[PDB]
Amino acid sequence: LSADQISTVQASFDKVKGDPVGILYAVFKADPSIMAKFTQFAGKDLESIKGTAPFETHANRIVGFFSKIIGELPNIEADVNTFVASHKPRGVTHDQLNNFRAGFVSYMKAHTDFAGAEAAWGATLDTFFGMIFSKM
């Protein structure tokens, strides 16, 4: 992960960072078992909660932290540590983490011309999920 790849990803992300709700929708849709961990959304229709105030609040927190991480590449260890501390006790699995990744990438492909940033994103996400999976 070097500066050329980091700048590519950060340019790519800048295009979509204003759509937290859409990104979170894509993740929940890829794996409903992620959605079922949120007491506020469990048992409701994703298509119906997507436009509500609670969904936006959550989406802003979650994608907001992801945004922190993308902004500081590659110096991400401390933030991954914080992530693991809050999420390890919620029992998040590797499967769910990989579905988060899949949902995100699906979002990016459906909303930008992704072909040009695809390798850089690969490097970034392999690094990020690489660190998480070494810790939980």
Ligand code: HEM
């Ligand atoms: C993919 C599996 C994941 C699951 C099952 C999951 C689940 C949750 C749950 C249950 C909460 C608490 C909601 C609440 O009570 O308010 C939460 C909050 C949060 N999640 Fe995750 N999450 C996942 C992935 C991620 C990822 C990849 C990030 C990185 C951006 C992230 C960042 C956050 C943040 C910042 C919060 C708010 C602070 C907190 O309560 O921890 N989550 N998530």
